[PDB]
């Protein structure tokens, strides 16, 4: 009977009755908590392992060690010593893998084709048994880590993240620098006689103890088979009894309370951070007092904190609630962005926060509020979307450290205890005497006197004046603040309509008129009471010029701003929407429980069509938008490279610069005039998909149409005005370079695009097979071996019905160097395709085949596939079977000549464009790089386009 290897098997693991997956919890003899998940339907299997150690446990003298260790586990073990055996195995079997390191966890996960779980899992287990920490792998990979940090140096959030740590108790582990870099991980340790390979060995051996591990494995196999699999590969992980680190002392003590920080940002942002130290509430998960308070302080409904701050013209957005620290400490935060007026009223903003908090004290804890949260969580759990395996295993592996086996599925959802004592206890901590205030603004530029070490952040620290504390300690009740009222959007009809006699497997065109094209599919898979309603509204006036594009955007920002109070309830109640301006007009998506969904939709369109602009709101949002256009200069070099390629290659695209300029001519009169004109003529293309009938779809569609007709007199657009934009057609054998400088970041970025031809069955699968075959090798060569940077990407580029192969890299090395390395790589690849076995070739076909045929696990993933088919106007709903049937037909030969025809350096149809984004500072061993021709340097985007042909558009299916 009893198994020596297993300490215990848990009881039934509580799950949604919608969840057909099966589950078994156990604890191994060496202390590993395990969840097993059997899903005989799944296409990919998955596992994850979470070690409850992370950077808070780094040696004080080697910042980043556990992060570095996390990179190093992938680079070879005693049992699979090839540096990239792991990632190549995954690649060849339709899988992928990643890992992350937080202060208390290191979390590793992969997925793979369901037939190769055991193979993937065996390779993975070795990470936790005997990594090699190869000496030469170590000297190389330390560059990946350094580059990971380089990218973050000039990110505002990362700097604030480390600044908070820099300003608490400096003796506290909380002040550690988790990322690491070349300095902390190589230079300084060399200076100090440290053998980093030994330190890695020591840290792994000391902390990667079985008692601190949780594993989750998801597979087609029975629960018994999964059980033996996990026993077999993980029993041997060794138990060293490591005590779980704990941090009962808060890193913010008294000398750190009532402090004000004035911080200089990189982007032009204006924000206020208010933070209070609290005890660790994790153990109170059955009541969740911190979520209760977040719900209330963070509310955006009538009566709310935000709603007053926004009326006063001081803030546009607010988040509040509990934020994690580590075992022993937490924080409660309330953060807002600041208008210009807001920037001068910080003191009053915070008084308001304290008045709102005093109101919660006065009314006392509210059982009815707790019930809503509880009901809404109960419903969210019952109808949760099936997760993608890799995310699911990863997530559960982390939380197995916090909840009994039997509750891991529900612990984060199901509320059980009403706890007015905890709610008051936490409320007693949200007091001016334990407050920390941080203001982020360019106005502090030059007025600061400190420098944070790791990021360079400039700031000032000041005692908040006792008198300001007092004024806050006496916050009176303010009549503008009320608790929210019953949330009427809470769904209660969950009936799944029976599948109609005329139901179809793909969307059907059930209406084709001048005004509107309606694609419809009743859900025949998921059976949750939800739906997705997507609409493209076409109008030439959304993008005719920069000015109109600015107006389209501001219109919609104003509209969302104006619906926000009303829409917030719907969103809490699992009904949300997304509304934005596109280069073709407008995009609207309403998703969630399909119960109350027509009410929200009808409200949106009605407000759209009878919209009245508040002037103060207009000015505020206009000023915010200007700044966001400027803030583009502080994006990363590789985002820049991607952006310019988009501008270069699309028929019509307005630059950020053009938009900025045109922005000053946006006046109130001008905007009021634009809206009716935009709405006067439209065509609507819709996908309605979910728990809805044909009749309800025609109904919803016509309702949108009628509302627009009634209030805005909309008429149909002419078929010819349904412009789609084309892609610049590159000449046989040309190479064009476009060069630019990133002014903020000290890295460069490049994007290289080898344009092939129009999309079609054969052309797509040539390009996809090739990308599949070169995919891990590019990563492995350009990053793991040559360490050109952290960001190294390769793959298909698809736009405007055209396609090709692209490379994106962000590096310290200059673009012209990057080019030559990619070119050298490309030659390695042709040779490699010649040299590979037939069977290696067929594995790649099979891996691409599995990737393409992976079934959607939830409604909105299936919707997205259809929506891609519609917005691209290819309407190829059965493309995966078609393209995969064709893929299976292909030979080495085909790919060799495809490459030779379209991709090789001397290819007769090479069509190459490169975007070079220079690092802030630049002024303008290895396989063999081919000689390259003189590029044509693009001097002006408009000229470049004028001088080239444009491709056709792709024909509909």
């Amino acid at each position: 009977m009893n198994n020596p290897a297993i300490k215990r098997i848990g009881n039934h693991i509580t799950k949604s009755p919608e969840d057909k997956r099966e589950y078994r919890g156990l604890e191994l003899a060496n202390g590993i908590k395990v969840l097993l998940i059997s899903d005989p339907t799944t296409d990919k299997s998955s596992a994850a392992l979470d070690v409850h150690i992370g950077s808070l446990s780094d040696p004080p003298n080697i910042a980043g060690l556990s992060h570095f260790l996390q990179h190093m586990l992938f680079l070879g073990t005693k049992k699979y010593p090839k540096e990239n055996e792991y990632s190549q195995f995954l690649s060849e079997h339709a899988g992928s893998s990643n890992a992350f390191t937080s202060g208390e966890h290191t979390n590793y996960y992969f997925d793979v084709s369901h037939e190769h779980l055991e193979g993937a899992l065996d390779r993975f287990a070795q990470f936790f048994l005997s990594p090699l920490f190869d000496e030469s792998a170590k000297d190389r990979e330390v560059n990946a880590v350094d580059s990971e940090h380089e990218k973050n140096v000039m990110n505002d959030a990362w700097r604030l993240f480390q600044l908070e740590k820099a300003t608490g108790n400096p003796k506290h582990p909380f002040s550690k620098f988790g990322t690491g870099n070349k300095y902390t991980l190589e230079t300084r340790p060399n200076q100090e006689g440290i053998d980093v390979r030994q330190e890695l060995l020591k840290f792994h051996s000391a902390y990667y103890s079985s008692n601190l591990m949780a594993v989750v494995v998801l597979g087609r196999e029975s629960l018994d088979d999964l059980t033996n699999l996990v026993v077999k590969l993980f029993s041997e992980v060794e138990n060293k009894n490591v005590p779980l680190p704990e941090f009962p002392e808060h890193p913010f003590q008294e000398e750190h309370l009532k402090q004000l920080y004035k911080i200089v940002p990189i982007k032009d942002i204006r924000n206020l951070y208010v933070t209070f130290p609290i005890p660790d509430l994790q153990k109170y998960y059955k009541s969740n007092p911190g979520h209760y308070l977040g719900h209330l302080i963070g509310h955006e409904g009538p009566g709310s904190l935000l709603s007053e701050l926004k009326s006063k013209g001081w803030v546009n957005t607010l988040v509040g609630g509990q934020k994690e620290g580590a075992r022993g400490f937490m924080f409660f935060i309330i953060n807002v962005d600041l208008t210009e007026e807001g920037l001068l009223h910080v003191e009053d903003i915070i008084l308001h926060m304290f008045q709102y908090i005093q109101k919660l004290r006065a009314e006392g804890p509210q059982e009815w509020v707790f019930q809503e949260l509880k009901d809404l969580n109960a419903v969210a759990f019952r109808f949760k979307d099936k997760e993608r395996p890799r995310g699911y295993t990863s997530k559960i592996a982390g939380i197995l450290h916090y909840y009994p086996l039997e509750e891991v599925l529900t612990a984060e959802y199901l509320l059980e205890e009403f706890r007015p004592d905890l709610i008051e206890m936490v409320l007693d901590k949200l007091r001016p005497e334990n407050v920390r205030v941080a203001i982020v603004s360019k106005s502090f530029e030059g007025k600061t006197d400190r420098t944070e070490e790791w990021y360079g952040t400039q700031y000032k620290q000041e005692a908040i004046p006792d008198e300001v504390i007092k004024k806050w300690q006496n916050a009176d009740l303010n009549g503008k603040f009320k608790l929210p009222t019953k949330n009427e959007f809470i769904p209660t009809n969950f009936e799944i309509l029976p599948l109609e006699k005329e139901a179809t497997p793909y969307p059907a065109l059930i209406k084709d008129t001048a005004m509107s094209k309606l694609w419809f599919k009743q859900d025949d898979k998921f059976f949750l009471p939800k739906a997705n309603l997507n609409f493209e509204f076409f109008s030439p006036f959304a993008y005719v010029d920069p000015l109109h594009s600015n107006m389209a955007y501001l219109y919609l920002e104003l509209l969302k701003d104006s619906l926000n109070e009303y829409a917030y309830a719907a969103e809490l109640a699992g009904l949300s929407y997304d509304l934005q301006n596109t280069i073709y007009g407008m995009y609207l998506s309403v998703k969630g429980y399909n119960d109350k969904q027509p009410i929200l939709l009808k409200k949106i369109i009605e407000k759209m069509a009878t919209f009245e602009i508040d002037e103060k709101r207009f000015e505020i949002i206009k000023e915010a938008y200007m700044r966001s256009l400027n803030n583009f200069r502080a994006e990363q070099p590789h985002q820049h490279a991607m952006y310019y390629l988009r501008l270069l290659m699309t028929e019509v695209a307005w630059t950020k610069d053009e938009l900025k300029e045109a922005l000053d001519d946006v006046t109130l009169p001008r905007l009021k005039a634009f809206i009716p004109q935009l709405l006067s003529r439209l065509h609507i293309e819709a996908l309605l998909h979910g728990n809805i009938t044909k009749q309800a779809a025609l109904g919803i569609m016509q309702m949108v149409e009628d509302t627009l007709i009634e209030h805005a007199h909309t008429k149909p657009l002419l078929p010819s005005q349904l412009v789609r934009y084309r892609e610049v057609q590159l000449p046989d054998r040309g190479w064009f370079v476009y060069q630019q400088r990133n002014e903020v970041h000290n890295n460069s970025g490049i994007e290289i695009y080898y344009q092939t031809d129009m999309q079609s069955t054969s052309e797509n699968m040539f390009l996809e097979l090739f990308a599949q075959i070169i995919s891990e090798p590019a990563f492995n060569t350009l990053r793991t071996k040559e360490q050109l940077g952290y960001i190294v990407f390769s793959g298909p580029r698809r736009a405007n019905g055209i396609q090709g192969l692209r490379f994106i890299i962000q590096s310290e090395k200059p673009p012209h160097y990057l080019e030559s390395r990619v070119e050298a790589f490309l030659i390695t690849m042709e040779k490699s395709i010649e040299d590979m076995t037939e069977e290696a070739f067929q594995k790649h076909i099979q891996a691409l085949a599995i990737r393409r045929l992976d079934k959607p696990k939830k409604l909105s993933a299936e919707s997205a596939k259809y929506w891609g088919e519609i917005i691209s106007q290819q309407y190829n709903f059965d493309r995966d079977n078609t393209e995969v049937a064709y893929l299976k037909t292909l030979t080495k030969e085909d790919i060799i000549k495809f490459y030779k025809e379209m991709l090789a350096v001397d290819a007769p149809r090479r069509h190459k464009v490169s975007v070079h984004v220079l690092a802030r500072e630049m002024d303008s061993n290895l396989s063999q790089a081919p000689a390259l021709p003189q590029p044509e340097v693009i001097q002006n985007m408009t000229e470049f386009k004028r001088g080239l042909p444009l491709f056709p558009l792709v024909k509909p299916h």
């Binding site: 950077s55 992060h67 996390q70 990643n98 890992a99 992350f100 390191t101 937080s102 990971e148 990110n155 505002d156 959030a157 990362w158 993240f161 988790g178 990322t179 942002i269 924000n271 957005t317 607010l318 988040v319 934020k323 994690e324 935060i333 953060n335 962005d337 994006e635 990363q636 985002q639």
Partner: peptide
Amino acid sequence: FVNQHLCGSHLVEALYLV
């Protein structure tokens, strides 16, 4: 791979990048 706390317009900013 490290991460941080992604709150408000910071989560928005991160989602762009990713």
